[PDB]
Amino acid sequence: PKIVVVGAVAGGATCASQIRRLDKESDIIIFEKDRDMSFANCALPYVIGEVVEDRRYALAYTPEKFYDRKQITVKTYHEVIAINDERQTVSVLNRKTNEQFEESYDKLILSPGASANSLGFESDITFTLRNLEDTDAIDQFIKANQVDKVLVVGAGYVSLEVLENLYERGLHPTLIHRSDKINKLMDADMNQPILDELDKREIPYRLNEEINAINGNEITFKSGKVEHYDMIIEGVGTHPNSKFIESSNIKLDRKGFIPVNDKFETNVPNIYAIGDIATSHYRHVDLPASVPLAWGAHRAASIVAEQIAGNDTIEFKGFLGNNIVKFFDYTFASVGVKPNELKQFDYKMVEVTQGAHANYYPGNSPLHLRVYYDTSNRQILRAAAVGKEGADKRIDVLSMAMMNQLTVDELTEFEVAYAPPYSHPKDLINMIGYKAK
Amino acid sequence: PKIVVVGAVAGGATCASQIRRLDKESDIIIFEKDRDMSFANCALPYVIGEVVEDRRYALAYTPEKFYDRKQITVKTYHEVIAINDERQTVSVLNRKTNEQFEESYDKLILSPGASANSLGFESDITFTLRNLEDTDAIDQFIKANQVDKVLVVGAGYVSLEVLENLYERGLHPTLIHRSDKINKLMDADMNQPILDELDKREIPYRLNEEINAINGNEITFKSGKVEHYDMIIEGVGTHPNSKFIESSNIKLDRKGFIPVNDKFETNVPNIYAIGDIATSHYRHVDLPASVPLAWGAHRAASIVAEQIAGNDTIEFKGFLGNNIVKFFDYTFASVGVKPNELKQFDYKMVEVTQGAHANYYPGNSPLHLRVYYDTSNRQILRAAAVGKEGADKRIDVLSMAMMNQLTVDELTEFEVAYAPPYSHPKDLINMIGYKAK
Numbered sequence A, B: 001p002k003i004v005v006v007g008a009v010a011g012g013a014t015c016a017s018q019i020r021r022l023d024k025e026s027d028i029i030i031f032e033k034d035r036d037m038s039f040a041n042c043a044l045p046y047v048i049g050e051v052v053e054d055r056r057y058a059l060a061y062t063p064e065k066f067y068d069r070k071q072i073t074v075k076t077y078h079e080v081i082a083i084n085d086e087r088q089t090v091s092v093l094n095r096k097t098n099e100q101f102e103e104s105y106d107k108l109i110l111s112p113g114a115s116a117n118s119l120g121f122e123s124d125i126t127f128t129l130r131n132l133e134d135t136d137a138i139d140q141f142i143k144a145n146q147v148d149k150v151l152v153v154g155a156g157y158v159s160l161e162v163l164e165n166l167y168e169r170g171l172h173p174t175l176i177h178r179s180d181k182i183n184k185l186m187d188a189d190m191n192q193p194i195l196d197e198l199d200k201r202e203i204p205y206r207l208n209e210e211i212n213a214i215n216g217n218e219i220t221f222k223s224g225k226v227e228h229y230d231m232i233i234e235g236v237g238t239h240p241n242s243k244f245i246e247s248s249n250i251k252l253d254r255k256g257f258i259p260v261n262d263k264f265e266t267n268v269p270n271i272y273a274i275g276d277i278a279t280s281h282y283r284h285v286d287l288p289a290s291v292p293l294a295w296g297a298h299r300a301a302s303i304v305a306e307q308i309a310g311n312d313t314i315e316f317k318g319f320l321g322n323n324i325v326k327f328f329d330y331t332f333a334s335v336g337v338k339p340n341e342l343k344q345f346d347y348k349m350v351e352v353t354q355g356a357h358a359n360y361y362p363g364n365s366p367l368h369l370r371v372y373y374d375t376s377n378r379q380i381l382r383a384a385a386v387g388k389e390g391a392d393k394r395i396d397v398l399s400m401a402m403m404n405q406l407t408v409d410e411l412t413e414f415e416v417a418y419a420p421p422y423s424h425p426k427d428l429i430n431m432i433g434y435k436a437k
């Protein structure tokens, strides 16, 4: 079938590539509104920090190389501006020539993702971070203006990674956030290490703070403070790239996302949606879920490739919401329903803080593991871990437990790999099970 | 019930402690034939390497402290020499006075573990490692003789840990092993990094080599080589501490171990056996299993505590055999049936070698993950991972998957915690799943 894909990055280029692995005959075309396809979204903060300096790690292909390798046509600077689903075409604006045209399709795959929100100030020193064009602009601005002081707005994982990277590059960032609710995917009382790491390095921060006015490099704040900054990076959330979908028959929810079934199909025949734009449900509980992360973009890309050109019996089984972020020496990871979703259940919480490995063994650091479970059936609802070591290991094990409908009590049965450098004979995970009841 | 425990370490002291958590009225007494209770068995190689300096780290309790905190009586230098099972008493030899006496019991818990084997040479420079007395003797001998060249016999994981520690302490070890099957719980081809690490540090080793004769410090080998050594640490296997059990009604297998049911009961009423002395079965396949490691001693300790003083519906579900060892920069971990047991199944092998984390993120290294599955039902039979980073995480996740007899195909559904420093959007575990078709 003739396949058209909208968006040429985590979900889109991946999906197109997976289809080509299975189907060598179909024509596949991807439209991407911006300059680059296949940029490494998750590498961007590290490119800014000069941790990742080889351009080949910043993006995988150019349209020419993608065509040579996979016979997939990718048109960059081409923005889809409407989906004419009844005639099975999309309307595309060639941004280089400013002319539009219709492209027909047998199957349409939507992976437009999200755009960064902006505070809306008229400021030449302010930047958001979403793609490689943004990354290049930020790097160039730092060099052209000999940037030293940078204001980082927002406290989600993107902003935190950007702050760490600016610091490692040798700049002097200050972090502000409109409330005290930083790194929201993690339990609010488990984020203190973020503030401790800032303090330890004397990196200034102010919570319940916002930009009030900008006059050149003079920034006036809500708190009444006035400071001079060379650059501002705003990480104040994202919004779905779905305005171009509104006039079509595709069903969107009130927040602008696309609900899909387990085959990643929209309500319209032959049109699929994957990636950040799509909403589905949790795997372990009967609740809606939206998890705008890379694992989901890649998993959905594979499922849609099977639906179109492979085993169409392969279907999604829902999200668990596994997520993680590094901030200086600490790791913050969680899986399951969000803190705000726990109230939909009668639940109990159990937790343990213990060394990541043998207490007598060097380089140890306390790991805090917390697990929430449903009192009606003892099923695990959510888990969170924070520590300098071993949090990723504990959360991935709990993600596998939740996939298998394990009860909190059965965690005493988990057989950990034990030697002094790695865990304890009764691992933190086993202790959660023993402490449950 | 009056409870008598034989052995005051990983299984025994733990079990007595777990019973006390549930029952504050029963009298509990533990007999330990040697000097110390609750020594840190797994810390011993590190104590020899001076990685663990504070000897307080190698001993968790003394009998006086155990009585003060848990009201449990522990008699060290007291060796149980016979079990008079029909009258429900044990005969105990007070090793300080050489006088024996009987101790009655309502429940008897055997956790005598295993003793180190010896090659049998008449040599004052040869030592074995099993407890803190041994560790003290080795340390004392190194200092008294200014030991430099040391022969480490045996290539099992503990001997390897001893070798690494002797090297880091500043001594010059040479490793020999009677066969080429080093670190036997790991796939043979995946153990090459052990030899690479030895070679990188110019630490000599000879496989399929054995001691022929010992004449003072002059050691003659099977190969015909003659070398002078200041000390020899023999890691030539262990044997069960069951000679004192032979006269009783307890059933022992041909190797001297005690087969137990899922309540860790022996064939004799009121007598339980846990730890290295006990044999059971695998959880995921119908085959016998013996896994003489710490996790099993602690898990059995809790199950026996529930049987005696808690919820008697709690029973063991079998072993998976999760194990791991660190050797210099590498980690070697495996779970499931042993290499030699794979022949009892019709199976296939799938493997991937990929970066432990994002390829562009610093300090990456190649992680080799291998999974064996049963062709009759797609169930995972065994998994092994070797690498400088991430092997423990992948093997613990697979242990959790096996606990639930998960299939190899379902690994595509595992939702990993992804950020650049930790994994990939399609993790190594997911890739095993994608490569299994």
Ligand SMILES: Cc1cc2nc3c(=O)[nH]c(=O)nc-3n(C[C@H](O)[C@H](O)[C@H](O)COP(=O)(O)OP(=O)(O)OC[C@H]3O[C@@H](n4cnc5c(N)ncnc54)[C@H](O)[C@@H]3O)c2cc1C
Pocket: A006, A007, A008, A009, A010, A011, A012, A031, A032, A033, A034, A041, A042, A043, A044, A045, A078, A079, A080, A081, A111, A112, A113, A114, A129, A130, A131, A158, A241, A244, A274, A275, A276, A277, A292, A293, A294, A295, A297, B418, B419, B420
């Ligand atoms: C700085 C940063 C760090 C991140 N870190 C992590 C992390 O560590 N771990 C993690 O799991 N996730 C991380 N993410 C999230 C991850 O990048 C997204 O979940 C993933 O990119 C979503 O894939 P997608 O295809 O939906 O969107 P994207 O990969 O963003 O691709 C969307 C594409 O479609 C294009 N598009 C939109 N509308 C149109 C249109 N009308 N016509 C043509 N093209 C269009 C856009 O220009 C864009 O190139 C990070 C994201 C960023 C920006």
Ligand SMILES: Cc1cc2nc3c(=O)[nH]c(=O)nc-3n(C[C@H](O)[C@H](O)[C@H](O)COP(=O)(O)OP(=O)(O)OC[C@H]3O[C@@H](n4cnc5c(N)ncnc54)[C@H](O)[C@@H]3O)c2cc1C
Pocket: A418, A419, A420, B006, B007, B008, B009, B010, B011, B012, B031, B032, B033, B034, B041, B042, B043, B044, B045, B078, B079, B080, B081, B111, B112, B113, B114, B129, B130, B131, B158, B241, B244, B274, B275, B276, B277, B292, B293, B294, B295, B297
């Ligand atoms: C150097 C070393 C390193 C190790 N490293 C690891 C590792 O990294 N990971 C891992 O999982 N496992 C490791 N182990 C294995 C682990 O220590 C054992 O699996 C665990 O100790 C078994 O518990 P147990 O109670 O059966 O035996 P033990 O803990 O050995 O205790 C047995 C006790 O009973 C006593 N006893 C025996 N007979 C009698 C008697 N007749 N009367 C009175 N007392 C008696 C013995 O003196 C001994 O103190 C290691 C062991 C050693 C020695």
Ligand SMILES: *SCCNC(=O)CCNC(=O)[C@H](O)C(C)(C)COP(=O)(O)OP(=O)(O)OC[C@H]1O[C@@H](n2cnc3c(N)ncnc32)[C@H](O)[C@@H]1OP(=O)(O)O
Pocket: A008, A009, A010, A011, A013, A014, A017, A018, A021, A037, A038, A039, A040, A041, A042, A043, A060, A061, A294, A302, B425, B434, B435
């Ligand atoms: S923010 C974190 C996520 N970031 C991104 O996704 C960045 C944008 N990504 C993309 O644009 C696409 O993901 C690109 C880079 C275009 C390619 O996507 P694929 O996932 O399909 O990758 P490749 O085609 O490059 O495959 C490379 C290696 O993986 C093996 N492989 C892919 N798919 C499969 C399946 N289904 N089964 C088995 N193996 C599979 C390939 O064989 C290949 O290994 P090599 O070592 O290259 O031979």
Ligand SMILES: *SCCNC(=O)CCNC(=O)[C@H](O)C(C)(C)COP(=O)(O)OP(=O)(O)OC[C@H]1O[C@@H](n2cnc3c(N)ncnc32)[C@H](O)[C@@H]1OP(=O)(O)O
Pocket: A425, A434, A435, B008, B009, B010, B013, B014, B017, B018, B021, B037, B038, B039, B040, B041, B042, B043, B060, B061, B294, B302
């Ligand atoms: S080679 C590796 C194996 N070697 C060894 O284990 C060495 C010898 N071991 C022992 O002698 C025992 O394992 C000792 C050191 C006596 C410990 O026995 P327990 O396992 O029973 O532990 P503690 O009573 O000392 O408890 C320490 C902490 O764990 C919590 N805990 C234990 N058991 C439970 C159960 N069933 N449920 C909830 N919590 C449990 C304790 O409350 C305690 O926590 P703290 O806040 O640190 O007091």
Ligand SMILES: [Cl-]
Pocket: A039, A040, A041, A042, A043
């Ligand atoms: Cl990336």
Ligand SMILES: [Cl-]
Pocket: A083, A084, A085, A086, A087, A088
């Ligand atoms: Cl239309």
Ligand SMILES: [Cl-]
Pocket: A351, A352, A353, A354
């Ligand atoms: Cl705790």
Ligand SMILES: [Cl-]
Pocket: B039, B040, B041, B042, B043
């Ligand atoms: Cl220990």
Ligand SMILES: [Cl-]
Pocket: B083, B084, B085, B086, B087, B088
């Ligand atoms: Cl008798």
Ligand SMILES: [Cl-]
Pocket: B259, B260, B261, B266, B267
């Ligand atoms: Cl039996």
Ligand SMILES: [Mg+2]
Pocket: A084
């Ligand atoms: Mg129309």
Ligand SMILES: [Mg+2]
Pocket: A353, A354
């Ligand atoms: Mg504590």
